Amino acid sequence: VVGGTEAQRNSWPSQISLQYRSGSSWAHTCGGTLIRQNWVMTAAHCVDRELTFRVVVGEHNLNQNDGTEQYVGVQKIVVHPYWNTDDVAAGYDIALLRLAQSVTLNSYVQLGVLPRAGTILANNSPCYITGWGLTRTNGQLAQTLQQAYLPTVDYAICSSSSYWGSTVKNSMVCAGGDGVRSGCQGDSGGPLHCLVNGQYAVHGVTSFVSRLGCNVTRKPTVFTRVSAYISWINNVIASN
Ligand SMILES: *C(=O)c1cccc(C)c1
Numbered sequence: 001v002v003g004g005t006e007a008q009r010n011s012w013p014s015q016i017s018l019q020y021r022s023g024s025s026w027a028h029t030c031g032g033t034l035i036r037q038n039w040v041m042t043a044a045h046c047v048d049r050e051l052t053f054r055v056v057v058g059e060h061n062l063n064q065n066d067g068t069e070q071y072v073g074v075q076k077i078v079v080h081p082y083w084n085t086d087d088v089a090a091g092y093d094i095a096l097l098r099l100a101q102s103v104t105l106n107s108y109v110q111l112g113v114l115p116r117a118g119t120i121l122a123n124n125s126p127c128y129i130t131g132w133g134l135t136r137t138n139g140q141l142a143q144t145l146q147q148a149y150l151p152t153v154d155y156a157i158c159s160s161s162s163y164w165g166s167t168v169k170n171s172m173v174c175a176g177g178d179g180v181r182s183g184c185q186g187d188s189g190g191p192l193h194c195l196v197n198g199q200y201a202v203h204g205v206t207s208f209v210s211r212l213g214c215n216v217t218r219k220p221t222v223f224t225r226v227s228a229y230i231s232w233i234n235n236v237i238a239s240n
């Protein structure tokens with residue numbers, strides 16, 4: 001997250017760190033949202049590589065003991081069947097991870113609330129992106145979980161020629177684009193939390209930013225629109 005602030009450690013208890021094994025260590029690669037005690041929602045592109053993955057819930061500082069973490073293996077990966085790694089602009093950037101154990105819930109570990117199917121946010125709706133991704137274009141991961149206020153940019157604006165054009169689909173949410181605040185590498189897969197009727201819900205799964213840079217004016221961060229995938233998510237959980 002470029003232009004973020006440090007989250008409070010109990011603000012976003014559905015945020016997870018998706019990590020892969022590197023030698024004798026683990027490296028953060030992506031975010032995700034805990035949606036059942038044994039299921040995480042992330043981006044398909046985050047699990048394209050044939051790596052060993054684990055999820056960390058209750059994580060605040062990637063580099064320090066928080067006293068709240070639970071570490072759990074990934075047992076099954078279900079990518080959306082229309083996902084194509086060569087075509088992130090086509091959409092379907094969503095995957096479900098079945099965890100090897102069910103995590104324990106507390107103030108640091110909670111299920112993410114998803115929107116009702118079909119819900120579309122008004123232009124300029126208040127949202128926060130969260131993650132441990134790079135804090136500058138071509139920079140380095142955050143140590144502590146970051147948040148940035150990224151108001152939505154509706155499909156009509158986001159898909160206009162001065163923004164993303166035909167690269168954005170109605171199956172996506174755009175947010176931000178102010179040139180200061182954005183998602184960045186390492187935030188992919190994580191949530192966009194939007195305040196609706198007094199409650200935060202996870203409306204987006206971070207999918208991409210511009211090849212030119214993270215915080216680029218009129219290139220808002222692009223997310224998979226969770227409300228387009230409610231039936232798919234329910235069908236996967238019910239069949240696994
Ligand atoms: C997320 O980590 C991410 C950043 C830039 C581009 C892509 C496709 C994903």
Ligand SMILES: [Ca+2]
Nearest residue numbers: 061064065066
């Ligand atoms: Ca930690």
